[PDB]
């Protein structure tokens, strides 16, 4: 169950997307998408 | 990778072909003459590069022992000099302790 | 430490190569197989001829020996050092390149009398360019190095293969003149072929 | 190593003692016993793993060149001249016409197989590096230095 | 809860109460799953 | 263009088998060398 | 190629893709620009995501 008293931890897998930030370059500069 | 098996990690292949034709607009069409004006070339190439991994578990000591195999190599290759009347005074300390 | 290095090769070269040029009647000239007409205009045609068979065999066995005690890091280093000047205008200095045979080891006995060793191994040497060039004088001593860093357990009085590198290779070429190369006892003067096989084995 | 791992976990005073490949644990009898058991749980034997890398490189080619190429120039009667296929008249004016002729068939085949071999143990990062290093001088006027380029099989 | 990594045995060291350790144990079991391989051309 | 697939089986036939076939047909193979075999045996058969 | 693959609910594979295709473009080899450090580089860059 992953429970301890009144607290617990939930594991949530994403199925239609990605966890994390997307980074790419435009020649001379770096862009980041949260 | 499963024990004793292998996998293709990656690779790169390339296939290519090119050709050219050059000629003199009218002279290139002459029966047994145009050959002196026409020009052609062909260039074909094929490249294959791969990286494969194979892993296994080691439990036994090297058999036969390294020193045995080395002696066989040195003797057959003619480099062996263990019978040198001078050097043996030292070599004995390494070969037999 | 046992270091074994075996080499074998087989080179075959046989045939000809045609190229060059000619001035004809001071009205036109001919270039053969993309010759450098800018100078070849006032030269001639060259028939290069190769004819060489070469066999080669080599073997090297090297054996470093080092005595230490349980849990005592021991160092063995047989090397050479190349020095060079960096006398600039503001900052000046000497620098160097060190390479050779080096062993760093930490031995340890286990419950079964087994010996575990932390091993760092270097096998360096001096690679050189064609000695006929100026690069043999200028501070360019190309260095070749083999590095191994691992841990292994060996039974008393036994041995293990730590690592190695092998290489096998073979190549060949065929060149010829589209029609002349097919002539009965003539084409040999136009055809060209080569073969180059090699085998290398290195282990520690 | 284990000395660092345990130290961080607890913070009992524990000090490593390399000379005898051992740990010095100071505390109460129960605390020492507790750590003793932990150590016994972690102190286990490792198996060996041999890694082989196969590198295969195959090459094949086929070149055919046959024919001619015409270009150049000529001075005629010191009154006019002719340039063929955009020749460089600035010098070609005092030259001639060139008939380049190519005639070459070439076949080529090559194969290379390389195999690095490396022995290690479970969970132990192993390194194999067969390389060459090119050195060069950067003796400037203020700053001076040596630099290099290293490449090979790693 | 104090957790320290121990690379040598590919394991985690979890210090706390019996319940806290059990709690983390289950979390680890939930996350520790096998992965499939993907070949890209 | 992109093409992707899931890999579940080990390379078949094993890499070392295919390599031997290549070396022999290409003429590079030298596993029968009376000298080098003293070492090569440790790699080819362990 | 830099890639991050991921399976979806339907067994689909999504990939974060960064692709570079670079090469060496050259000037007329008969000029001094073939000697001076001027190796003109051609590059094709693609950065996207696809299922």
Residue C165: is it exposed, middle or buried by C-beta count within 10 angstroms (0-12/13-18/19+)? buried
Q: Note the resolution in Å, 1 decimal.
A: 3.6
Minimal CA–CA distance to C148: which of C158, C159, C161?
A: C161
Residue C17 near residue C195, CB atoms below 8 Å: no
CB contact under 8 A, G9 and A18: no
Structure tokens at C61: 């066995």
Tell me which chain D residues have a C-beta less than 8 angstroms from the C-beta of E9.
42, 44, 123
Alpha-carbon span C32 to C25, nearest angstrom: 17
Minimal CA–CA distance to B69: which of C153, C203, C156, F28?
A: C203
Residue G22's H or E segment, with its range, is strand G13-24
Residue C131 near residue C139, CB atoms below 8 Å: no
Residue F21 lies in a domain: yes
| C144 three-state secondary structure | strand
Q: Which residues of E touch chain D, with CB atoms under 8 Å apart?
A: 2, 4-10, 13, 15
Angle in degrees, CA D78, D82, D84, rounded to 5 = 155
Contacting partners of chain F (3+ CB pairs under 8 A): B, C, D, E, G
CB contact under 8 A, F19 and D52: no
Q: What are phi and psi of B95, to 5 degrees?
A: -80, -35
Residue F32 lies in a domain: yes
Structure tokens at B50: 């791969």
Residue F44 lies in a domain: yes
Residue C107's H or E segment, with its range, is strand C94-109
Interface mutation vs chain F, best among D48, D55, D56, D117, most F CBs within 10 Å = D56
Residue C202 near residue C161, CB atoms below 8 Å: no
Strands C94-109 and C74-85: antiparallel
Chain D contact for B1 (CB, 8 A cutoff): no
Tell me which chain F residues have a C-beta less than 8 angstroms from the C-beta of E37.
6-8
DSSP letter at F10?
Answer: P
Alpha-carbon span D129 to D116, nearest angstrom: 9
What sign does the dihedral B59-B65-B70-B72 (CA atoms) show?
negative
Structure tokens at G4: 């991050």
Structure tokens at B51: 């990286």
Place of tokens 């590079």: F28
Tell me which chain D residues have a C-beta less than 8 angstroms from the C-beta of B54.
51-52, 54
Alpha-carbon span C194 to B13, nearest angstrom: 26
Residue G20: is it exposed, middle or buried by C-beta count within 10 angstroms (0-12/13-18/19+)? exposed
Strands D97-121 and C28-32: parallel
Residue B90 — left, alpha, or beta (φ > 0 → left; ψ -120 to 50 → alpha)? alpha
Say how far residue C47 (Cα) sits from the centre of its chain.
30
Q: What are phi and psi of C165, to 5 degrees?
A: -155, 130
Euclidean distance between the first and the last CA atom of chain B, given in angstroms as a whole number: 43
Tell me which chain A residues have a C-beta less than 8 angstroms from the C-beta of G8.
15-16
Distance from CA of F11 to the nearest CA of E (A): 13
Strands G13-24 and G41-50: antiparallel
Structure tokens at F5: 């697939």
Tell me which chain E residues have a C-beta less than 8 angstroms from the C-beta of A3.
23
Tell me which chain F residues have a C-beta less than 8 angstroms from the C-beta of G50.
2
Residue F2 lies in a domain: no
Strands D80-84 and D48-76: antiparallel
Which residues form the domain of F41? 9-46
CB contact under 8 A, A4 and E20: yes
Alpha-carbon span C18 to D47, nearest angstrom: 62
CB contact under 8 A, B94 and C63: yes
CA distance readout (Å), C21 to C177, D74, D140: 17, 19, 47
Cis peptide leading into residue B4 (ω within 30°)? no
Residues 6+ apart with CB under 8 A from E5: D5, E12, E13
Place of tokens 């009347």: B85
Q: What are phi and psi of C98, to 5 degrees?
A: -115, 135
Say how far residue G28 (Cα) sits from the centre of its chain.
25
Structure tokens at C86: 């960096």
How much helix, strand and coil, in percent to the nearest 5, is found in chain A?
0, 40, 60
Distance from CA of E31 to the nearest CA of F (A): 21
Residue F40: is it exposed, middle or buried by C-beta count within 10 angstroms (0-12/13-18/19+)? buried
CB contact under 8 A, A11 and E30: yes
Residue C64 near residue C122, CB atoms below 8 Å: no
Place of tokens 């008969």: G30
Chain breaks in chain E (C to N over 2.5 A) after: none
Residue D36 near residue D25, CB atoms below 8 Å: yes
CB–CB contacts below 8 A, D to E:
23
Residue F39 lies in a domain: yes
| G9 three-state secondary structure | coil
The per-type count for chain A, helices as H runs and strands as E runs, is 0, 4
Q: Pinpoint the alpha helices (H) of chain D.
A: 2-10, 29-42, 89-92
What sign does the dihedral D17-D21-D23-D24 (CA atoms) show?
negative
Cis peptide leading into residue B64 (ω within 30°)? yes
Alpha-carbon span C160 to D119, nearest angstrom: 9
DSSP letter at D11?
Answer: -
Residues 6+ apart with CB under 8 A from F29: C168, F20, F23
Scored b (16 or more CB within 10 A) or e, B13-38 reads eeeeeeeeeeebeeebeeeeeeeebb
CA-nearest residue to E37 within chain F is F7
What sign does the dihedral D23-C154-F44-B70 (CA atoms) show?
positive
Alpha-carbon span F39 to B24, nearest angstrom: 63
Tell me which chain E residues have a C-beta less than 8 angstroms from the C-beta of F3.
40-41
| Domain edges within chain C | 1-204
Residue E27's H or E segment, with its range, is helix E18-31
Alpha-carbon span B21 to E36, nearest angstrom: 51
Alpha-carbon span F10 to B29, nearest angstrom: 59
Residues 6+ apart with CB under 8 A from D91: none
Residue B47's H or E segment, with its range, is strand B39-58
Minimal CA–CA distance to D154: which of D51, D24, D46, D22?
A: D51
Strands A7-8 and A3-4: antiparallel
Tell me which chain B residues have a C-beta less than 8 angstroms from the C-beta of C161.
62, 66
Residue C106 near residue C118, CB atoms below 8 Å: yes
Please indicate the experimental technique that yielded this structure.
cryo-EM
Residue C29 near residue C22, CB atoms below 8 Å: yes
Q: Which of F10, F16, F34 sits opposite B7 (nearest CB)?
A: F10
| D17 three-state secondary structure | strand
Residue E4 near residue D9, CB atoms below 8 Å: yes
**How many CB atoms neighbour CB C8 within 10 A?**
19
CB contact under 8 A, B50 and D66: no
Alpha-carbon span C118 to C133, nearest angstrom: 43
Alpha-carbon span A10 to A22, nearest angstrom: 25
3-state DSSP of D99-120? EEEEEEEEEEEEEEEEEEEEEE
Tell me which chain G residues have a C-beta less than 8 angstroms from the C-beta of E40.
1, 3, 5, 15
Q: What are phi and psi of D136, to 5 degrees?
A: -150, 150
Cis peptide leading into residue D106 (ω within 30°)? no
Domain count of the fold of chain F = 1
Tell me which chain B residues have a C-beta less than 8 angstroms from the C-beta of C159.
61-62, 65-67
Interface mutation vs chain F, best among C3, C5, C6, C59, most F CBs within 10 Å = C6
Angle in degrees, CA C154, C160, C164, rounded to 5 = 145
Alpha-carbon span C6 to B1, nearest angstrom: 31
Residue C59 near residue C7, CB atoms below 8 Å: yes
Instruction: Give me the half-sphere count of Cα atoms (radius 13 Å) on the Cβ side of residue B59.
Output: 1
Structure tokens at D23: 């740990």
Chains C and A touch (3+ CB pairs under 8 A): no
Residue C186: is it exposed, middle or buried by C-beta count within 10 angstroms (0-12/13-18/19+)? exposed
* Length in residues, chain E: 41
Chain D contact for B18 (CB, 8 A cutoff): no
Residue C77 near residue D132, CB atoms below 8 Å: no
Alpha-carbon span C153 to D119, nearest angstrom: 11
How much helix, strand and coil, in percent to the nearest 5, is found in chain D?
20, 55, 25
**How many CB atoms neighbour CB B63 within 10 A?**
13
CA-nearest residue to D1 within chain E is E8
Distance from CA of E21 to the nearest CA of D (A): 14
Alpha-carbon span D98 to C27, nearest angstrom: 9
CB contact under 8 A, G7 and E36: yes
Chain G contact for E29 (CB, 8 A cutoff): no
Say how far residue G24 (Cα) sits from the centre of its chain.
13
CA distance readout (Å), D29 to B85, D7, D22, E18: 65, 18, 18, 21
Minimal CA–CA distance to C13: which of C204, C197, C196?
A: C196
CB contact under 8 A, A2 and E31: no
Distance from CA of E35 to the nearest CA of A (A): 14
């Amino acid at each position: 169950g992953i429970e301890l008293g009144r607290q617990k931890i939930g594991v949530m897998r994403l199925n239609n997307t990605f966890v994390g930030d997307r980074t790419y370059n435009l020649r001379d500069q770096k862009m980041v998408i949260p | 990778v499963p024990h004793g098996k292998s996998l293709l990690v990656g690779g790169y292949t390339r296939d290519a072909n090119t050709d050219t034709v050059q000629s003199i607009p009218f002279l290139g069409k002459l029966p047994l003459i145009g050959s002196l004006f026409r020009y052609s070339s062909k260039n074909k190439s094929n490249v294959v590069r791969v990286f494969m991994i194979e892993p296994k578990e080691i439990v036994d000591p090297l058999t036969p022992d390294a020193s045995e195999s080395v002696n066989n190599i040195l003797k057959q290759s003619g480099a062996w000099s263990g019978d040198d009347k001078l050097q043996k005074w030292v070599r004995v300390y390494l070969d037999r302790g | 430490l046992w270091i074994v290095d075996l080499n074998k090769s087989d080179l075959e070269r046989l045939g000809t190569s045609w190229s060059g040029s000619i001035t004809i009647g001071d009205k036109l000239g001919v270039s053969l197989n993309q010759s450098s007409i800018s100078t070849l205009d006032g030269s001639r045609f060259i028939a290069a001829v190769n004819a060489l068979e070469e066999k080669k065999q080599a073997t090297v066995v090297s054996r470093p020996v080092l005595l230490t005690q349980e849990n005592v890091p021991a160092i063995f280093d047989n090397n050479r050092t190349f020095y060079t000047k960096l006398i600039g205008e503001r900052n000046v200095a000497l620098e160097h390149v060190t390479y050779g045979t080096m062993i760093r080891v930490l031995p340890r006995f286990s419950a079964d009398g087994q010996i575990e060793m932390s091993l760092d191994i270097e096998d360096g040497n001096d690679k050189t360019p064609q000695s006929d060039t100026t690069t043999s004088v200028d501070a360019l001593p190309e260095v070749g190095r083999t590095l191994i860093s691992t841990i292994a357990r060996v039974p008393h009085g036994k041995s293990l293969l730590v690592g190695g590198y092998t290489r096998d290779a073979n190549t060949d070429t065929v060149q010829s003149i589209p029609f002349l190369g097919k002539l009965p006892l003539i084409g040999s003067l136009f055809r060209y072929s080569s073969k180059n096989k090699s085998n290398v084995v290195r282990v520690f | 190593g284990i000395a660092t791992a345990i130290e961080r976990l607890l913070q009992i005073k524990i000090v490593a003692y390399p000379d005898t490949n051992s740990l010095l644990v100071k505390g109460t009898a129960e605390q020492v016993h507790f750590i003793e058991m932990l150590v016994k749980a972690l102190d286990v034997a490792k198996r060996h793993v041999e890694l082989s890398l196969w590198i295969v490189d195959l090459n094949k080619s086929d070149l055919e060149r046959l024919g001619t190429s015409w270009s150049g120039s000529i001075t005629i009667g010191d009154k006019l001249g002719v340039s063929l296929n955009q020749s460089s008249i600035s010098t070609l004016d005092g030259s001639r016409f060139i008939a380049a002729v190519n005639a070459l068939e070439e076949k080529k085949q090559a194969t290379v197989v390389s195999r690095p071999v490396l022995l290690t143990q479970e969970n132990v990062p192993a390194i194999f590096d067969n390389n060459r290093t090119f050195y060069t001088k950067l003796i400037g006027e203020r700053n001076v230095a040596l630099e290099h380029v290293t490449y090979g099989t790693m």
